Structure formats: structure tokens, C-alpha cells
Amino acid sequence: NKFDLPKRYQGSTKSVWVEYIQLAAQYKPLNLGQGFPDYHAPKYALNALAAAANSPDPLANQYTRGFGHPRLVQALSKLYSQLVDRTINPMTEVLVTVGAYEALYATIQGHVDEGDEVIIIEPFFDCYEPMVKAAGGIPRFIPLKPNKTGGTISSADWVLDNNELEALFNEKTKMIIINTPHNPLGKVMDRAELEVVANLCKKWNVLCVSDEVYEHMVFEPFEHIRICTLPGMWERTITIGSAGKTFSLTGWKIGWAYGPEALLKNLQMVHQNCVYTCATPIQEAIAVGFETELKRLKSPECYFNSISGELMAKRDYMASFLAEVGMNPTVPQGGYFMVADWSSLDSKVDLTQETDARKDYRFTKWMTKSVGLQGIPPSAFYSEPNKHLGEDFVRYCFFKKDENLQKAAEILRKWKGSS
Amino acid sequence: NKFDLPKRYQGSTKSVWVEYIQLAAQYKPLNLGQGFPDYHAPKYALNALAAAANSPDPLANQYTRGFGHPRLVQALSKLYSQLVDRTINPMTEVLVTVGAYEALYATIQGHVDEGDEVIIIEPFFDCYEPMVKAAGGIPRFIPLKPNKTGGTISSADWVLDNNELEALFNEKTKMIIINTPHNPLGKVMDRAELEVVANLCKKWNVLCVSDEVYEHMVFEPFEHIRICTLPGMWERTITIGSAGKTFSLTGWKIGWAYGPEALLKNLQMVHQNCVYTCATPIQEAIAVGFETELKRLKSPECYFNSISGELMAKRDYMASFLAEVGMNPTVPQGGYFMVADWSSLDSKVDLTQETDARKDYRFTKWMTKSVGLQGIPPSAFYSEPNKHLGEDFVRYCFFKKDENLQKAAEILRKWKGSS
């Protein structure tokens, strides 16, 4: 008891991640659970890391500026200044962090004090709730729910109850966390939903935290819209991005938070006495990535532009083979995850020997063991009392080699064909 | 007022690093301030990061294991198992972190709760105090004090009051943090000194956090001795290392904590909801760097063995010109920093145009701007009540090319002028 966790980690769980990493190592299924590319990222980013390691400058591999590598943050402000259509100060309005993860951490620790209520949308990215709780905050959850059922559906169909949302704000609301494009639904919030959240933030003096890591992977004909761009919102928005999702190099763990300096000062105090600085040769390589892209921004071969169409064909392909097998897929407006409703297969599969509390866990582990195809359970992304809303579903990642996609389609075809 | 620093970050100011790194960026001095080499680190490690970037393995640049890169944790287990003369589980008893900075953070946040007292030896590495306060703990300081006044002196002369150490230990004491080799002094703790701490931790059931980043930098004839290897000490010690210091790649920001699984589980939990995981290619490169050195642990060519000999000459050179000039240098037993009392020279400097409240701050600023040589003020390593003890000193880094140690002697020699 003496050396037990401090109180502020009451509800403290292992991530669903570990146990599925262990299951995939044991049975070696066709793995649709990892939210990263089967195959290699754009070379030029990669080449830049090799160049920074090989650099003739002795300081390329020594400590860099704590709030962001200079060359890094100059490029960030260039890219974002054009997209948010104001000039972002690279030195005071941009903070570089150990992924979008540590950006989320600096923000939540910097702006959530004991008892502040933070509004979270379900299904949530996994870190959201434990970070709120560790900061002494109180989570307030509200789920996105399909406004239809059967085949045949879009991530725009998953919506909040507007009245519910409204009643969740009061003079105790410190913060709201919105994630768009949404993990794992793929829902890209349209102007009116953003407008809804914006109008509630202004009323209630709430800080909006905008997790825009999949900013660049919105599918035609949908469009990504930043909430820090809406009226009066700049002053009350921290927007978060990630190099790992921007350049498909998730093992690089560099991200950023941008916003007014008044909001960012809070992150800085947390950051300097948490990690202090980030890796120089990686930030250097990302700065050269951004510089390569900044030269050809309007151009189709810009990775920010190209990546949508690269994914879309796999998006469409997966939605097809999952519908073929008897699921109803939610077609994502953006990103690379797909949520599919498998419940009409529940009479065709034997979950008897599966011991998890939740049926999506049973189903997704049975599928690994029985036919060698791994997905992830969406109920791991809900607050205990709402877990029932994710049990009919499964999460698959389609950022995969065309041949591995085709193998998943026939593992499923041949499972159905007999049964 | 809504968006003020939360209570636990109340009275938070920018660190000396955010301030002096920005100072160094401004006036372009000879930088003997923050610790890093101004010349290349081992070529085998730099080559290993280039290879990891260029790897045909498409997992090389994607997420790795959250508690540490499998290949890395194994190498760290192989080495420290030899060094602690026991079998360290790479899986449960090692955590890779973002520098020793996060290893200290995940330790403090994982083991300090509201009202828990922590013993911090002055002058302390400046992160320790604000981290205990962010975790809700009460720091209790004790100064090390030189026992002779000429000269020149050794860092072994800087000693603790044994009665006044004992006094600090009570039922509320959760944690004591020792740093050996010591920053800023270079003090390596002998067996009596570590036994003195060890016995008191065993008597009051306290947790010893051993920050040993400079473990490979002990000069002859002194020796690095690990506190966890003392009797009954393993079950109550977390030992921290850093690849920035082991390999002289400070811009890599990779460190570790090893200790019993019971005490490490707390850390894993903090790491998990902070950054989640660390850079894959960097950890891969550090793993190969250990695999190289493991093959030759007793070779003069081994960097763990070569680096002392390399720094000792630089340390003797620096101690020589600092003394020569009028300063009273403390000659360090390990590491690459040197404290010198510069107060014999306050008639020979003009601090009247510096804004800082502490004299060593004014001193080190004036030197940077006026003569082009940067050091670091030691009062930044003292608790407020005892900052008067660091005012007369200056900390330099002798981890440089001879030509820049000469450039620095030449700056002091001419600045010594005739007045």
C-alpha cells in the first residue's frame, strides 16, 4: 500500500492494445488491428532522417530548442498560417511534443484542475478519459450514434443528440475534446456541427481541444474544416496534429499543439518538466518533409493531397467485402479505420469458449483464433455504462498492402461460403 | 482567470534551459552552458540511425512496444544484469522513456501523492523540485558543502551533514533522490556515502531514486558504484540511465528506468498516459549501439571505458585555466561539468546592467553578451531559501574540442585584461 499508485490514478487500466499485440503474436492472423501502413511511407521523409543522422553538423544529433526545433516550428507556422488564414507565431503559438499524444497530455494537464468537467465524445480515442481523470478532472461523456441501421451507411449518420450536448455544458465545463476526422468512426464534422460546438464554447467560456491528427485524409467529396477558424474560436482552441499521421511514420512520435500564446503557456509549463525537449534528427527530418510539401501544396502529388485517393480505393474495397460477408460497414468520410456492425453473424459464430465481458472482444478474439483475421473491439472506446453501444461492432484498418486486403476478403469469403 | 495554471503548477516559471538556450541562440557565444559535445558521437550509433531510416523492414518506422523497443529492452537487460549482478527482466523491470527527463517524471508521478515528502540533495538537477511539486509532494532539501577553502578542491570535498540528513527522514518520507555522478558538482558518492543513504532508506522504508545518467564518466581513480546493488536496496530503488549521455547523442532523448517489477508498474502507468511510446528508429539505433559495446565491455575501444580518459584531459585543462584566471575550481570526480567560485573577480566585472535578482545569473548573462562565453548559474540548482549558496559560482561544460577549450582559456585570459 505504501507504494501503490497515487490516488489520481483511480481507474487505472492497461490498454486494449497490449492484449491484442499478444494475440497477434501468438496466432499471427492477417492483422487489420494496427493503425499504420503495412508498407513504406514516402521515401523523401525517410531519406531526410538518414541524412540527419549522417549530417556533418555535430549538433544535428545534440539537444534542440525545448518548445520545438527551430526549423520545425518555422515550417509548421508556414503550413498552418495558410490553412487557418492568419499568421501563426512559430515561437509562441506552436509547441512540438512527443506525438499528438504528449500534446494531448500537456493540454489536459495544463488546463484541467481538480474538479473541472471535461466533455468527451464516444467512441473516444483511448487516452482521453484516463488523462482527464489523472489531471483530477471529471469526464462527461456523450456518444455518437447511427441514425440508421441496416446495410448501408455513412459516418455522417453517427451524430450527437443536440439537446443532450446542450445540457452537458454549465459553469463547471472547463473543456471539450473533439476529434475530427474521428477515430475510429471516420466522421468528419461539418460546418454546422462545428458551429454547434463553437456556439456552446462561447456561451460557457469553454476551451475547445481539437484533435485533428487525420486532417489530411478526408475523402471526396467531404472536406476538413478547422474549428480554430470559426468566429471568436482562435482565442479558445488548441488544435493538435501529428507527424506520424501526416507522413505515415507513426514510429517517429512527433506532434504539435497550436493556438494563442495565452492558451499555450499552460502546455509549456507541463512540457518543460515532463520531457523538456524532443528528438532533434526526427524533427529535422519532418521539417524537411514539410518543406518538400510546402513547395508543391496545390499540386496533386503533394502527400497531403494524394493520400486521400490512395486510401479511398481501399476504403471502398473493405466496405465491399465486409458487406459481402454480412456486416453493415460504416463508410468513413476520412482516415483509415472502418467500424462494421457484425451482430447478424452472431448466430453463425461460436463465442462459447470466449471469456471477455464484452461481445466485441469475444468476437474479435474468436475471429483471430478461428479464421485468422484480427480486428479491434470498439467497446474499449466507451465509458463503462455506454459499452453496450459498441458491442455489435468491430474496428478494422484498411491502410494495408492491396494483397493483404485481398487475403482478408477471401478469408471472409471462404468463411461464409461454408456457413 | 478560468485558464490559469492549475493549482499544482501554481508559481511555475520558465526553467533556466528555456531561458539560457534562448540566450545562447541570441548572442551567439562559445556555449559551455548546456551539456552536449560540440563534435561527433560514435559513428556506429549514427550509422545505426541511418540504417533504421533506410531499413527495408516496414515496421522499423512504425509504432513499437509501449514500455520499450523489444530489441532495446533486451540489450539494456543484458548489460545491467551484469552490472547489478542479478537477472533484470527486460519485460517487467525496464521502461524506456523520453530521455532521463521522462524516466524522472514517470517515477515522481508514479510514486509521489498529496503530502508525500521527498528528500532532494542540493545543488540538485533543476527538474527534481518542480516535478515533486507537480505531483503534490513536499520537497525537503539538504545542501552539500565544501569542507575546505583552498585549493584547488575536489568534488569529494562537497559533503552532507549526517545528523541533518537523518533529521529529514520521518514517517511521511516517501522518496529520496540521489544523483551520482552529480550535476553540477561531478561528485561521485563513495561506499560510506551510499551506505548512509541505504541504511536510512532501509530504516524508514523509503524509496531511493538513483539518477545515474553519467554512470560511465567516472575519472580514475574514483569508481561508479550502483546503490541498487547494496543490501536490501534492489527492492526499494529505481535507477535511471540515459542514451543521450551513455552515447553522447543528447538530441536523441531516450532514457530508462530499471528496478523491481513492483516499483516499475507505477511508472509504466504514468508513461502509458503521457507519451505512450517512444521513437522506433532511435531506439533501434540505441539497441545496436549496446550490442556493439556488449561485445567489448573491457576494451579501451569501448565507449563506456574510453570516454573518461577522453574527458579527463579536458577537465585538467579547464581546472587549470579557471584557477589560473582567479576562480576557485572544484575538480570533478566524474561527468563533464565544473563548478568554480568566481567571486575573487567581482571587482573585475560589471553586473549593474543585468536585470536578474541572483548574482550568478547576472554574471553568467553578462559573460555571454559581453565576452562571448556561456556558462550556467548554479543557484538555479538550489531551493529558494538556499539560492544564496550558488550565487558565487558558475558551472561550465568541458565536453568540447580542445580548440574551443583553448578559445575559452583565451577569452578568460584577455578578459582578465590588466584590470
Ligand SMILES: Cc1ncc(COP(=O)(O)O)c(CN[C@@H](CS)C(=O)O)c1O
Ligand atoms: C543529472 C541529470 N539527470 C537527467 C538529465 C536529463 O537527461 P535526458 O536524457 O537528456 O532527458 C540530465 C541532462 N542534463 C542537461 C540538462 S538538459 C544539463 O544539465 O546540462 C542530467 O544532467
